[PDB]
Amino acid sequence: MTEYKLVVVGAGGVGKSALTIQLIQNHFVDECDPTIEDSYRKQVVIDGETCLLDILDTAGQEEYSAMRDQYMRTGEGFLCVFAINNTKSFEDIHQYREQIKRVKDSDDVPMVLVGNKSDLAARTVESRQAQDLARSYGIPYIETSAKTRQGVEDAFYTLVREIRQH
Ligand SMILES: C[C@@H](OP(=O)(O)OP(=O)(O)OP(=O)(O)OC[C@H]1O[C@@H](n2cnc3c(=O)[nH]c(N)nc32)[C@H](O)[C@@H]1O)c1ccccc1[N+](=O)[O-]
Ligand SMILES: *CC(=O)N(C)CCN(C)c1ccc([N+](=O)[O-])c2nonc12
Ligand SMILES: [Mg+2]
């Protein structure tokens, strides 16, 4: 029925795959499996609407390319992931945001900012600066853990609400 094209973007190793698998398959993967591209599709219920999620798990940049453009350009909404113990992945959200806007050639793209690995202590990115980042872009912010499942439904189902509202 009603499909939602989602894309999971952000730096290498911030938990993009781990997040998606947890949502779709309901377990935590504790392994090193670099992604080229992988998609996941599951029927779920969101606020009483039966719908399909069509989800695209990307690679960290390593850089923009036409090939990467070719995969991402069909996405409807973007889950922009960083990890709260890795300041570089946080500094990188600006680039993706920007890249996503250029790929979709739009000044308003459905988006949500995700801060992953919330089970880990001694964070290097405070919730305040990140929450302030989401607000400066006018988009929501959700903290998550692929390991504990904290926030993971919130993050994804929220992006769907941003897609419904655009
Ligand atoms: C090549 C690149 O690959 P990548 O595809 O850029 O990396 P992903 O963003 O898909 O990241 P992934 O979900 O594979 O998780 C990487 C590691 O962090 C762990 N992890 C993910 N989410 C969480 C979480 O919420 N909590 C905790 N405690 N751990 C979590 C995983 O168990 C794994 O060991 C890549 C892949 C794997 C590892 C690193 C890496 N990198 O570039 O840095
Ligand atoms: C699991 C994994 O990342 N690989 C099989 C790729 C090869 N490895 C082990 C690898 C690649 C790149 C980097 N890096 O530049 O950071 C690595 N750091 O530790 N293992 C790395
Ligand atoms: Mg991955």
PDB file of all heavy atoms in Angstrom, residues 9 80 92-102 107 111 136-137 139:
ATOM      1  N   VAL A   9      21.985   7.765   6.350  1.00  0.00           N
ATOM      2  CA  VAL A   9      23.185   8.440   5.920  1.00  0.00           C
ATOM      3  C   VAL A   9      23.972   8.905   7.124  1.00  0.00           C
ATOM      4  O   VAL A   9      23.448   9.140   8.212  1.00  0.00           O
ATOM      5  CB  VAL A   9      22.855   9.636   4.957  1.00  0.00           C
ATOM      6  CG1 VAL A   9      21.993   9.184   3.840  1.00  0.00           C
ATOM      7  CG2 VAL A   9      22.190  10.817   5.666  1.00  0.00           C
ATOM      8  N   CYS A  80      19.617  11.014   9.431  1.00  0.00           N
ATOM      9  CA  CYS A  80      20.969  11.552   9.383  1.00  0.00           C
ATOM     10  C   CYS A  80      21.617  11.174  10.699  1.00  0.00           C
ATOM     11  O   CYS A  80      21.242  11.732  11.773  1.00  0.00           O
ATOM     12  CB  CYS A  80      20.953  13.066   9.169  1.00  0.00           C
ATOM     13  SG  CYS A  80      20.259  13.680   7.629  1.00  0.00           S
ATOM     14  N   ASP A  92      30.275  16.177  10.606  1.00  0.00           N
ATOM     15  CA  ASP A  92      29.949  15.705   9.228  1.00  0.00           C
ATOM     16  C   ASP A  92      28.457  15.827   8.832  1.00  0.00           C
ATOM     17  O   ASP A  92      28.140  15.819   7.630  1.00  0.00           O
ATOM     18  CB  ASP A  92      30.336  14.208   9.003  1.00  0.00           C
ATOM     19  CG  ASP A  92      31.857  13.944   8.955  1.00  0.00           C
ATOM     20  OD1 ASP A  92      32.669  14.864   8.664  1.00  0.00           O
ATOM     21  OD2 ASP A  92      32.263  12.759   9.172  1.00  0.00           O
ATOM     22  N   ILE A  93      27.567  15.906   9.807  1.00  0.00           N
ATOM     23  CA  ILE A  93      26.143  16.038   9.534  1.00  0.00           C
ATOM     24  C   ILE A  93      25.914  17.251   8.623  1.00  0.00           C
ATOM     25  O   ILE A  93      25.040  17.190   7.744  1.00  0.00           O
ATOM     26  CB  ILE A  93      25.320  16.170  10.789  1.00  0.00           C
ATOM     27  CG1 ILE A  93      25.344  14.837  11.571  1.00  0.00           C
ATOM     28  CG2 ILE A  93      23.913  16.587  10.456  1.00  0.00           C
ATOM     29  CD1 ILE A  93      24.542  13.691  11.007  1.00  0.00           C
ATOM     30  N   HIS A  94      26.644  18.354   8.803  1.00  0.00           N
ATOM     31  CA  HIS A  94      26.460  19.523   7.921  1.00  0.00           C
ATOM     32  C   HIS A  94      26.627  19.115   6.462  1.00  0.00           C
ATOM     33  O   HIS A  94      25.858  19.537   5.602  1.00  0.00           O
ATOM     34  CB  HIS A  94      27.471  20.642   8.247  1.00  0.00           C
ATOM     35  CG  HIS A  94      27.208  21.352   9.540  1.00  0.00           C
ATOM     36  ND1 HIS A  94      28.045  21.323  10.639  1.00  0.00           N
ATOM     37  CD2 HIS A  94      26.194  22.174   9.870  1.00  0.00           C
ATOM     38  CE1 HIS A  94      27.527  22.083  11.602  1.00  0.00           C
ATOM     39  NE2 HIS A  94      26.407  22.616  11.152  1.00  0.00           N
ATOM     40  N   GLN A  95      27.636  18.303   6.163  1.00  0.00           N
ATOM     41  CA  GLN A  95      27.944  17.905   4.807  1.00  0.00           C
ATOM     42  C   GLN A  95      26.819  17.097   4.207  1.00  0.00           C
ATOM     43  O   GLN A  95      26.410  17.381   3.071  1.00  0.00           O
ATOM     44  CB  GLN A  95      29.302  17.165   4.756  1.00  0.00           C
ATOM     45  CG  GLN A  95      30.494  18.149   4.762  1.00  0.00           C
ATOM     46  CD  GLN A  95      31.851  17.467   4.929  1.00  0.00           C
ATOM     47  OE1 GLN A  95      32.869  18.004   4.500  1.00  0.00           O
ATOM     48  NE2 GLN A  95      31.868  16.290   5.567  1.00  0.00           N
ATOM     49  N   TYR A  96      26.316  16.119   4.932  1.00  0.00           N
ATOM     50  CA  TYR A  96      25.243  15.284   4.430  1.00  0.00           C
ATOM     51  C   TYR A  96      24.009  16.122   4.223  1.00  0.00           C
ATOM     52  O   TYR A  96      23.368  16.067   3.156  1.00  0.00           O
ATOM     53  CB  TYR A  96      24.930  14.109   5.375  1.00  0.00           C
ATOM     54  CG  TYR A  96      26.018  13.097   5.469  1.00  0.00           C
ATOM     55  CD1 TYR A  96      26.921  13.088   6.513  1.00  0.00           C
ATOM     56  CD2 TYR A  96      26.083  12.087   4.570  1.00  0.00           C
ATOM     57  CE1 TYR A  96      27.934  12.154   6.579  1.00  0.00           C
ATOM     58  CE2 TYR A  96      27.092  11.151   4.595  1.00  0.00           C
ATOM     59  CZ  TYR A  96      28.010  11.185   5.610  1.00  0.00           C
ATOM     60  OH  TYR A  96      29.034  10.257   5.634  1.00  0.00           O
ATOM     61  N   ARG A  97      23.630  16.849   5.278  1.00  0.00           N
ATOM     62  CA  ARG A  97      22.476  17.711   5.141  1.00  0.00           C
ATOM     63  C   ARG A  97      22.640  18.349   3.796  1.00  0.00           C
ATOM     64  O   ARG A  97      21.726  18.390   3.010  1.00  0.00           O
ATOM     65  CB  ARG A  97      22.434  18.834   6.213  1.00  0.00           C
ATOM     66  CG  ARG A  97      21.303  19.866   6.011  1.00  0.00           C
ATOM     67  CD  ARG A  97      20.963  20.675   7.204  1.00  0.00           C
ATOM     68  NE  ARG A  97      20.015  21.733   6.863  1.00  0.00           N
ATOM     69  CZ  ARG A  97      20.338  23.007   6.624  1.00  0.00           C
ATOM     70  NH1 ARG A  97      21.599  23.414   6.627  1.00  0.00           N
ATOM     71  NH2 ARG A  97      19.394  23.900   6.334  1.00  0.00           N
ATOM     72  N   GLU A  98      23.764  19.023   3.625  1.00  0.00           N
ATOM     73  CA  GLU A  98      24.006  19.809   2.383  1.00  0.00           C
ATOM     74  C   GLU A  98      23.938  18.933   1.134  1.00  0.00           C
ATOM     75  O   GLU A  98      23.341  19.306   0.129  1.00  0.00           O
ATOM     76  CB  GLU A  98      25.390  20.501   2.373  1.00  0.00           C
ATOM     77  CG  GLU A  98      25.639  21.429   1.184  1.00  0.00           C
ATOM     78  CD  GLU A  98      27.064  21.444   0.693  1.00  0.00           C
ATOM     79  OE1 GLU A  98      27.513  20.458   0.050  1.00  0.00           O
ATOM     80  OE2 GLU A  98      27.738  22.485   0.883  1.00  0.00           O
ATOM     81  N   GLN A  99      24.586  17.780   1.211  1.00  0.00           N
ATOM     82  CA  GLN A  99      24.631  16.843   0.089  1.00  0.00           C
ATOM     83  C   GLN A  99      23.229  16.374  -0.243  1.00  0.00           C
ATOM     84  O   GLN A  99      22.841  16.339  -1.405  1.00  0.00           O
ATOM     85  CB  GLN A  99      25.568  15.669   0.427  1.00  0.00           C
ATOM     86  CG  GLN A  99      26.945  15.914  -0.200  1.00  0.00           C
ATOM     87  CD  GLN A  99      27.900  14.723  -0.309  1.00  0.00           C
ATOM     88  OE1 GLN A  99      27.542  13.577  -0.048  1.00  0.00           O
ATOM     89  NE2 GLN A  99      29.151  15.022  -0.673  1.00  0.00           N
ATOM     90  N   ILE A 100      22.441  16.082   0.770  1.00  0.00           N
ATOM     91  CA  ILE A 100      21.066  15.604   0.562  1.00  0.00           C
ATOM     92  C   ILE A 100      20.247  16.680  -0.133  1.00  0.00           C
ATOM     93  O   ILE A 100      19.521  16.409  -1.089  1.00  0.00           O
ATOM     94  CB  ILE A 100      20.359  15.187   1.871  1.00  0.00           C
ATOM     95  CG1 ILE A 100      20.971  13.913   2.459  1.00  0.00           C
ATOM     96  CG2 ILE A 100      18.884  14.926   1.630  1.00  0.00           C
ATOM     97  CD1 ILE A 100      20.754  13.751   3.956  1.00  0.00           C
ATOM     98  N   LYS A 101      20.391  17.922   0.291  1.00  0.00           N
ATOM     99  CA  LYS A 101      19.635  19.005  -0.317  1.00  0.00           C
ATOM    100  C   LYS A 101      20.028  19.175  -1.784  1.00  0.00           C
ATOM    101  O   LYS A 101      19.180  19.433  -2.637  1.00  0.00           O
ATOM    102  CB  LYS A 101      19.805  20.292   0.502  1.00  0.00           C
ATOM    103  CG  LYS A 101      19.071  20.274   1.860  1.00  0.00           C
ATOM    104  CD  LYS A 101      19.401  21.470   2.716  1.00  0.00           C
ATOM    105  CE  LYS A 101      18.858  22.781   2.161  1.00  0.00           C
ATOM    106  NZ  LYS A 101      17.371  22.927   2.082  1.00  0.00           N
ATOM    107  N   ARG A 102      21.318  19.039  -2.084  1.00  0.00           N
ATOM    108  CA  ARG A 102      21.804  19.107  -3.464  1.00  0.00           C
ATOM    109  C   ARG A 102      21.351  17.894  -4.282  1.00  0.00           C
ATOM    110  O   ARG A 102      20.907  18.053  -5.431  1.00  0.00           O
ATOM    111  CB  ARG A 102      23.323  19.227  -3.479  1.00  0.00           C
ATOM    112  CG  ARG A 102      23.817  20.518  -2.818  1.00  0.00           C
ATOM    113  CD  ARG A 102      25.325  20.557  -2.674  1.00  0.00           C
ATOM    114  NE  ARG A 102      25.979  20.842  -3.962  1.00  0.00           N
ATOM    115  CZ  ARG A 102      27.297  20.949  -4.129  1.00  0.00           C
ATOM    116  NH1 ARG A 102      28.105  20.762  -3.084  1.00  0.00           N
ATOM    117  NH2 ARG A 102      27.811  21.241  -5.317  1.00  0.00           N
ATOM    118  N   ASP A 107      15.010  22.694  -1.114  1.00  0.00           N
ATOM    119  CA  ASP A 107      15.276  23.477   0.090  1.00  0.00           C
ATOM    120  C   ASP A 107      14.514  22.946   1.302  1.00  0.00           C
ATOM    121  O   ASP A 107      14.641  23.492   2.400  1.00  0.00           O
ATOM    122  CB  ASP A 107      14.959  24.975  -0.132  1.00  0.00           C
ATOM    123  CG  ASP A 107      13.731  25.225  -1.031  1.00  0.00           C
ATOM    124  OD1 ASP A 107      13.318  24.323  -1.807  1.00  0.00           O
ATOM    125  OD2 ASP A 107      13.195  26.364  -0.991  1.00  0.00           O
ATOM    126  N   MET A 111      13.630  14.980   7.056  1.00  0.00           N
ATOM    127  CA  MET A 111      14.904  14.650   7.659  1.00  0.00           C
ATOM    128  C   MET A 111      14.769  14.599   9.169  1.00  0.00           C
ATOM    129  O   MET A 111      13.951  15.275   9.776  1.00  0.00           O
ATOM    130  CB  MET A 111      15.930  15.714   7.283  1.00  0.00           C
ATOM    131  CG  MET A 111      17.405  15.372   7.593  1.00  0.00           C
ATOM    132  SD  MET A 111      18.539  16.699   7.090  1.00  0.00           S
ATOM    133  CE  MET A 111      17.790  17.325   5.620  1.00  0.00           C
ATOM    134  N   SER A 136      18.365  24.466  14.728  1.00  0.00           N
ATOM    135  CA  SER A 136      18.900  25.449  13.757  1.00  0.00           C
ATOM    136  C   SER A 136      18.576  25.067  12.307  1.00  0.00           C
ATOM    137  O   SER A 136      18.493  25.941  11.428  1.00  0.00           O
ATOM    138  CB  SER A 136      20.415  25.675  13.973  1.00  0.00           C
ATOM    139  OG  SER A 136      21.226  24.618  13.471  1.00  0.00           O
ATOM    140  N   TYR A 137      18.400  23.759  12.056  1.00  0.00           N
ATOM    141  CA  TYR A 137      17.965  23.226  10.732  1.00  0.00           C
ATOM    142  C   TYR A 137      16.417  23.113  10.669  1.00  0.00           C
ATOM    143  O   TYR A 137      15.853  22.868   9.606  1.00  0.00           O
ATOM    144  CB  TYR A 137      18.483  21.816  10.470  1.00  0.00           C
ATOM    145  CG  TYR A 137      19.940  21.619  10.282  1.00  0.00           C
ATOM    146  CD1 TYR A 137      20.448  20.330  10.430  1.00  0.00           C
ATOM    147  CD2 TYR A 137      20.797  22.640   9.915  1.00  0.00           C
ATOM    148  CE1 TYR A 137      21.762  20.066  10.248  1.00  0.00           C
ATOM    149  CE2 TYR A 137      22.163  22.371   9.721  1.00  0.00           C
ATOM    150  CZ  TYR A 137      22.622  21.082   9.910  1.00  0.00           C
ATOM    151  OH  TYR A 137      23.943  20.692   9.703  1.00  0.00           O
ATOM    152  N   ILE A 139      14.495  20.708  12.231  1.00  0.00           N
ATOM    153  CA  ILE A 139      14.114  19.328  12.096  1.00  0.00           C
ATOM    154  C   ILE A 139      14.181  18.701  13.457  1.00  0.00           C
ATOM    155  O   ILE A 139      14.794  19.259  14.381  1.00  0.00           O
ATOM    156  CB  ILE A 139      15.028  18.545  11.109  1.00  0.00           C
ATOM    157  CG1 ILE A 139      16.416  18.245  11.718  1.00  0.00           C
ATOM    158  CG2 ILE A 139      15.140  19.272   9.780  1.00  0.00           C
ATOM    159  CD1 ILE A 139      17.392  17.426  10.812  1.00  0.00           C
TER     160      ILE A 139
END
